[PDB]
Amino acid sequence: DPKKVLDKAKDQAENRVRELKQVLEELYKEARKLDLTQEMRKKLIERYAAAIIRAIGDINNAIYQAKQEAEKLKKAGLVNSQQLDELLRRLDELQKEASRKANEYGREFELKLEYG
């Protein structure tokens, strides 16, 4: 049923954002301890960009995975075309609410690099 699709998407997103936070925390904890050569700074900024691209990519993938799961239920008439639309709307809401967390942590880290 549609709730399990949306619930799955929600878990994926939540975990991907949790994972992004952990990774950026661990990255900061090493940047602070070490004496950063120009090189070691360059590497650290590369790992941060990768972490972000990874999270944004996985969120996106969870969301369009759920779009495929929903679109399939419709061809198995297990959801009427209104229920499909409540789903595609709550997915779109989920996408936005996860994108805002990625942007938040991206910036938080960006300031810890300049100032913190």
Binding site: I53, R54, E110
Partner: protein, 151 residues
């Protein structure tokens, strides 16, 4: 090498369009079909990830500090890190390409337009050379178009 040729065309063109604002009018391989549908998809989805993560992306672009062409080799390292946990999906893929477009826009504003093709050759080279069999198993760009299609 068909898959490389086709992947470069798509990626290369999206990056150029994005940087300039002007859509190509030259003929692709596919008149009506797969490269065209992939470009259409990439415009919809990749324009979306750029709007929705403008903040994250500006942050990254500022710190990677992509002045010139040495710095373009450092995007490769970024791509390789992304994939280094073993996982490959189209979300990761479209997001790299969309970040590539974001940096291509940026290069154009510094009159480094000539670094846009190298950038695109370089995204393509990582993607195809390191995920070739995965892409083929997914039906290539046909699979891309299918995965993101909305109707």
């Amino acid at each position: 090498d068909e898959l490389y040729r086709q992947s470069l065309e798509i990626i290369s063109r999206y990056l150029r369009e994005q940087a300039t604002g002007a859509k190509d009018t030259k003929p692709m391989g596919r008149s009506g079909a797969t490269s065209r549908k992939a470009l259409e998809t990439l415009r919809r989805v990749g324009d979306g990830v750029q709007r929705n993560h403008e903040t994250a992306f500006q942050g990254m672009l500022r710190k990677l500090d992509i002045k010139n062409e040495d710095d373009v080799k450092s995007l490769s390292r970024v791509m390789i890190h992304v994939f280094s946990d073993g996982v490959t999906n189209w979300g990761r893929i479209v997001t790299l390409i969309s970040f590539g477009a974001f940096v291509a826009k940026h290069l154009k504003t510094i009159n480094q337009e000539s670094c846009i093709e190298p950038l695109a050759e370089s995204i393509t080279d990582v993607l195809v050379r390191t995920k070739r069999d995965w892409l083929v198993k997914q039906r290539g760009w046909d699979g891309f178009v299918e995965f993101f299609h909305v109707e």
